[PDB]
């Protein structure tokens, strides 16, 4: 409503998804903006239904959470035209991962059903309604945890269990082929083999509903082919991963199963360095590191999406993934003769691109990036 417009009697105040940035960019104003962002975010949640309707349709949710993959990395690797990108139904162009470290990224994704917390708040219990997989478990979705690695490094599996709330045994990894040896010496299993094992298991369950969290490490720095001294080239590993995901999408299409696949990277690999951070360093969660390619694809729909993916251009983060899940949770979109793809992809929650690690916050303010180290004065991020 403009200055000489009127609201209607009884109108609620309109709550914007992103707090305004009209004040000049001083330390005090950027500090105040961040506190305003935290306040607004803490009031945001996806509301799941109390129970599924009796005519709900079972399907499987598979969340594919990829370490060390940002749009900047895809560009630097020369992989923007890989066929995988064109295979999604929905593709986010300004999805912010909120952090540049793996543990906090996974916790943020597991807490996708509420607005974005400060880094501090990630490591304290959240409201039960914030845990996406718990919301689904409540509605009868079997929970699965899957990885292409053992989760030992960095206490990652412990963080997923303790702070992410995912209290499920790691799916059996015995007999899987090894694709890489990790920077810590342990195996990174072949992703197509992990996904095919998942697909056989789900196929054993029938018209079950299930929700799987799958974390993938092949793009992490320091990974090598067994016996090879040098770190495998990033673009070779990324091509291999994208070819395996595309092959799996083909397998999923052939299966006829109803599946919602969400691909959401944790954070970038810092393949292309910048003034402050040489290639591979990611202690500051810069815009390049945190703008990641998130996508959604539906399989087994009576009326599948045709043509190129629907681009979501607005600033987004995990809350938008949770909203797409609740829009799908009754399974009815899978059996509709005609889907309103506009409505399905419109009015998704927008989230300002704020990113944090324990010691640093990065924001965009009036279109420019700033960093705050340990609660001190804001400084322009040097890009
Ligand atoms: Zn990671």
XYZ file of C-alpha atoms and ligand atoms in Angstrom:
384
model
C 0.000 0.000 0.000
C 1.429 3.365 -1.137
C 1.353 6.616 0.897
C -2.171 7.610 -0.201
C -3.595 4.113 -0.351
C -5.746 2.732 2.468
C -5.894 -0.690 4.035
C -9.256 -2.373 4.559
C -11.051 -2.307 8.119
C -9.760 -5.304 10.082
C -6.644 -5.953 7.894
C -3.733 -7.616 9.699
C -0.305 -5.941 9.366
C 1.442 -7.401 6.256
C 4.530 -9.356 7.389
C 7.295 -9.212 4.720
C 9.473 -12.333 4.239
C 12.623 -10.189 4.107
C 13.156 -7.235 6.479
C 13.622 -3.892 4.683
C 17.097 -2.349 4.232
C 16.383 1.318 3.713
C 18.596 2.594 6.596
C 22.214 3.559 5.672
C 24.747 0.693 5.992
C 26.370 1.621 9.333
C 27.492 -1.014 11.859
C 24.550 -0.101 14.115
C 22.012 -0.422 11.273
C 23.426 -3.724 9.996
C 23.453 -5.094 13.569
C 19.839 -3.946 13.990
C 18.884 -5.477 10.615
C 20.333 -8.832 11.675
C 18.413 -8.809 14.942
C 15.254 -7.910 12.941
C 15.965 -10.874 10.648
C 16.374 -13.243 13.619
C 13.107 -11.992 15.182
C 11.148 -12.437 11.968
C 12.630 -15.860 11.254
C 11.832 -17.237 14.713
C 8.103 -16.667 14.000
C 8.182 -18.670 10.738
C 7.175 -22.291 10.405
C 5.692 -24.690 7.947
C 2.450 -26.034 9.290
C 2.037 -29.769 8.713
C -1.468 -31.271 8.900
C -2.540 -32.985 12.129
C -2.942 -36.295 10.238
C -3.114 -37.369 6.606
C -6.603 -37.582 4.998
C -7.929 -41.113 4.442
C -7.425 -40.764 0.648
C -3.747 -39.688 0.978
C -1.364 -41.347 -1.468
C 1.891 -42.954 -0.201
C 5.159 -41.830 -1.743
C 8.864 -41.654 -0.857
C 10.829 -38.456 -0.106
C 14.571 -38.662 -0.851
C 16.738 -35.703 0.217
C 20.171 -35.748 -1.443
C 22.496 -33.466 0.575
C 25.780 -32.875 -1.246
C 28.969 -31.587 0.366
C 31.055 -28.967 -1.470
C 28.816 -27.950 -4.409
C 27.831 -24.324 -5.165
C 26.804 -22.583 -8.361
C 30.238 -20.943 -8.398
C 31.832 -24.402 -8.328
C 29.587 -25.617 -11.188
C 30.616 -22.555 -13.242
C 34.357 -22.935 -12.426
C 34.165 -26.659 -13.258
C 32.482 -25.962 -16.635
C 29.425 -28.041 -15.741
C 26.505 -25.585 -16.152
C 25.306 -27.496 -19.211
C 25.414 -30.940 -17.639
C 22.071 -32.631 -18.527
C 21.244 -33.139 -14.790
C 20.226 -29.493 -14.394
C 17.662 -29.751 -17.129
C 16.066 -32.835 -15.568
C 14.610 -31.173 -12.479
C 11.041 -29.986 -12.202
C 12.002 -27.038 -9.971
C 15.445 -25.413 -9.800
C 16.488 -22.711 -7.350
C 18.862 -20.014 -8.622
C 19.305 -18.052 -5.379
C 19.159 -20.733 -2.673
C 21.355 -19.843 0.297
C 22.857 -22.664 2.334
C 23.238 -20.470 5.451
C 26.776 -21.694 6.320
C 29.986 -22.974 4.839
C 30.537 -26.008 7.128
C 29.054 -29.473 6.781
C 27.695 -30.072 10.294
C 25.771 -26.825 10.582
C 24.488 -27.247 7.001
C 23.025 -30.643 7.758
C 21.444 -29.405 10.996
C 19.917 -26.401 9.170
C 18.411 -28.725 6.541
C 17.104 -31.145 9.196
C 15.482 -28.123 10.892
C 13.952 -26.877 7.593
C 10.378 -26.554 8.962
C 11.102 -23.401 10.983
C 12.764 -20.135 10.032
C 16.500 -19.618 10.022
C 18.276 -19.617 13.433
C 21.535 -18.031 14.510
C 24.486 -20.353 14.619
C 24.280 -20.417 18.454
C 20.602 -21.568 18.292
C 21.578 -24.508 15.999
C 23.367 -26.217 18.822
C 20.487 -26.009 21.309
C 17.287 -28.102 21.032
C 14.681 -26.659 18.723
C 10.925 -26.862 18.896
C 9.813 -30.394 17.800
C 7.867 -28.889 14.832
C 11.091 -27.598 13.317
C 12.461 -31.049 12.454
C 11.319 -31.865 8.936
C 11.843 -35.645 9.264
C 10.037 -35.724 12.631
C 7.068 -33.943 11.086
C 7.048 -36.666 8.432
C 7.569 -39.506 10.948
C 4.475 -38.240 12.827
C 2.474 -38.622 9.592
C 3.589 -42.236 9.013
C 6.739 -41.771 6.925
C 9.446 -44.315 7.805
C 12.738 -42.459 8.451
C 16.017 -43.531 6.857
C 19.550 -42.213 7.102
C 21.932 -43.032 4.303
C 25.472 -41.874 3.524
C 28.183 -42.610 0.999
C 30.702 -42.381 3.860
C 30.938 -43.375 7.506
C 30.243 -39.903 9.017
C 33.167 -40.131 11.456
C 35.133 -37.152 10.254
C 34.260 -33.950 12.132
C 31.786 -35.898 14.283
C 29.350 -35.397 11.402
C 27.148 -38.418 12.110
C 27.031 -37.438 15.816
C 25.892 -33.888 14.837
C 23.190 -35.307 12.524
C 21.897 -37.499 15.409
C 22.255 -35.037 18.317
C 21.431 -31.667 16.805
C 19.717 -32.748 13.576
C 17.510 -35.104 15.604
C 17.944 -37.972 13.151
C 17.938 -40.992 15.535
C 18.078 -43.755 12.861
C 20.802 -46.285 12.203
C 22.962 -45.638 9.204
C 21.720 -47.833 6.312
C 23.855 -50.898 5.639
C 27.058 -50.064 3.737
C 28.504 -53.631 3.606
C 29.358 -54.808 0.104
C 29.212 -51.365 -1.504
C 31.914 -50.529 -4.042
C 34.383 -47.800 -3.110
C 34.543 -44.853 -5.523
C 37.094 -42.689 -3.673
C 39.219 -42.640 -0.569
C 38.465 -39.675 1.537
C 40.712 -36.970 2.822
C 40.613 -38.962 6.153
C 41.472 -42.370 4.513
C 38.004 -43.867 4.825
C 35.867 -44.921 1.879
C 33.497 -42.846 -0.175
C 31.129 -45.409 -1.648
C 29.795 -45.240 -5.187
C 26.650 -43.121 -5.165
C 24.763 -45.047 -7.831
C 25.363 -48.226 -5.781
C 24.065 -46.523 -2.616
C 20.975 -45.229 -4.496
C 20.263 -48.593 -6.160
C 20.429 -50.307 -2.754
C 17.948 -47.727 -1.453
C 15.636 -48.339 -4.460
C 15.583 -52.152 -3.963
C 14.808 -51.641 -0.211
C 11.865 -49.277 -0.936
C 10.590 -51.533 -3.610
C 10.528 -54.363 -0.921
C 8.150 -52.195 1.265
C 5.227 -51.681 -1.229
C 2.902 -48.635 -0.941
C 4.975 -47.549 2.004
C 5.731 -43.978 2.723
C 9.247 -43.091 3.680
C 11.599 -40.148 4.033
C 15.334 -40.570 3.566
C 18.205 -38.221 4.369
C 21.200 -39.024 2.181
C 24.551 -37.241 2.702
C 27.228 -37.369 -0.031
C 30.928 -36.582 0.313
C 32.617 -37.223 -3.092
C 33.193 -33.533 -3.901
C 34.980 -32.819 -0.596
C 38.569 -31.594 -0.928
C 41.283 -34.244 -0.579
C 39.369 -37.213 -2.011
C 41.310 -39.453 -4.365
C 40.857 -42.556 -6.501
C 42.178 -45.629 -4.613
C 45.917 -45.874 -5.156
C 46.230 -42.429 -6.713
C 48.310 -39.878 -4.865
C 46.864 -36.582 -6.187
C 43.358 -35.381 -5.174
C 40.991 -36.341 -7.988
C 40.102 -33.387 -10.146
C 36.929 -31.675 -8.918
C 35.353 -31.523 -12.387
C 35.980 -35.275 -12.865
C 34.305 -36.055 -9.547
C 31.416 -33.674 -10.222
C 30.835 -35.085 -13.721
C 30.888 -38.611 -12.238
C 28.386 -37.627 -9.545
C 26.072 -35.842 -11.955
C 26.197 -38.775 -14.403
C 25.348 -41.160 -11.559
C 22.462 -38.999 -10.329
C 21.097 -38.752 -13.861
C 21.419 -42.520 -14.321
C 19.544 -42.975 -11.074
C 16.798 -40.563 -12.138
C 16.374 -42.824 -15.220
C 16.143 -45.905 -12.953
C 13.555 -44.088 -10.840
C 11.467 -43.206 -13.902
C 11.575 -46.896 -14.981
C 10.489 -48.074 -11.511
C 7.171 -46.183 -11.749
C 7.425 -45.434 -7.996
C 6.035 -42.163 -6.624
C 9.105 -40.275 -5.383
C 9.893 -36.698 -4.473
C 13.648 -36.076 -4.873
C 15.178 -32.941 -3.343
C 18.800 -32.156 -4.160
C 20.246 -29.539 -1.762
C 23.965 -28.982 -1.324
C 25.391 -28.205 2.099
C 27.754 -25.415 0.916
C 30.298 -24.883 -1.808
C 33.784 -26.361 -2.140
C 35.423 -22.961 -2.664
C 36.823 -24.218 -6.010
C 37.322 -20.624 -7.240
C 39.087 -18.575 -4.578
C 38.725 -14.836 -4.034
C 40.674 -11.963 -2.447
C 40.100 -13.041 1.151
C 39.945 -16.803 0.727
C 42.328 -18.791 -1.483
C 40.815 -21.779 -3.322
C 39.622 -24.473 -0.893
C 39.358 -22.173 2.139
C 35.785 -21.573 3.314
C 35.952 -20.277 6.902
C 33.967 -17.207 5.869
C 30.567 -18.193 4.370
C 30.764 -15.915 1.348
C 27.947 -15.521 -1.190
C 29.938 -17.568 -3.709
C 30.286 -20.452 -1.237
C 26.676 -20.421 -0.009
C 24.631 -19.882 -3.234
C 23.955 -23.558 -4.055
C 22.014 -25.459 -6.755
C 18.947 -26.871 -5.095
C 16.408 -28.778 -7.189
C 13.267 -30.849 -6.872
C 12.053 -33.607 -9.170
C 8.861 -35.656 -8.890
C 8.699 -39.215 -10.230
C 5.660 -41.367 -10.866
C 3.173 -38.508 -11.384
C 0.071 -39.157 -13.483
C 0.765 -35.714 -15.024
C 4.534 -35.096 -14.944
C 6.045 -31.632 -15.497
C 7.102 -31.143 -19.136
C 9.940 -29.043 -20.490
C 12.688 -27.163 -18.730
C 12.707 -26.825 -14.957
C 10.715 -24.053 -13.323
C 13.312 -21.581 -12.049
C 12.795 -20.137 -8.590
C 14.659 -16.827 -8.724
C 13.683 -15.264 -5.388
C 16.118 -15.486 -2.432
C 15.318 -18.854 -0.815
C 16.593 -21.320 1.721
C 15.536 -24.464 3.633
C 12.101 -23.167 4.611
C 11.095 -23.250 0.904
C 12.040 -26.963 0.740
C 9.885 -27.653 3.778
C 6.998 -25.772 2.139
C 7.272 -27.852 -1.027
C 7.224 -31.003 1.136
C 4.058 -29.987 2.938
C 2.424 -29.119 -0.462
C 3.200 -32.709 -1.499
C 2.694 -34.514 1.801
C -0.794 -35.904 1.119
C 0.616 -37.418 -2.087
C -2.335 -36.136 -4.117
C -0.252 -34.228 -6.623
C 0.986 -37.662 -7.862
C -2.470 -38.772 -8.955
C -3.972 -35.496 -10.263
C -4.952 -35.584 -13.944
C -3.657 -32.014 -14.282
C -1.251 -30.214 -11.922
C -1.227 -26.474 -11.463
C 2.576 -26.079 -11.550
C 2.321 -22.320 -11.187
C 0.398 -22.538 -7.968
C 2.684 -25.320 -6.678
C 5.809 -23.186 -7.241
C 4.339 -19.746 -6.336
C 4.240 -17.946 -2.958
C 7.077 -20.018 -1.563
C 8.756 -18.527 1.464
C 11.626 -16.156 0.643
C 14.580 -15.872 2.995
C 17.290 -13.224 3.007
C 20.794 -14.631 2.253
C 22.297 -14.622 5.711
C 25.054 -17.137 6.414
C 26.957 -18.008 9.552
C 29.604 -20.113 11.106
C 30.528 -19.890 14.863
C 32.712 -16.889 14.298
C 31.324 -15.019 11.328
C 28.088 -13.713 9.816
C 27.762 -12.703 6.167
C 24.790 -10.694 4.841
C 23.761 -8.836 1.711
C 22.711 -5.272 2.537
C 21.467 -2.988 -0.236
C 22.907 -5.515 -2.680
C 26.463 -5.578 -1.273
C 28.038 -8.269 0.917
C 29.270 -7.533 4.463
C 30.960 -9.687 7.042
C 30.921 -9.457 10.870
C 33.659 -11.257 12.746
C 32.700 -12.347 16.291
C 30.068 -9.715 16.861
C 32.456 -6.814 16.031
C 32.037 -4.030 13.366
C 30.725 -4.938 9.905
C 33.172 -4.646 7.009
C 32.541 -5.049 3.288
C 33.342 -8.569 2.154
C 36.179 -7.919 -0.350
C 34.874 -10.385 -3.035
Zn 30.439 -30.298 3.561
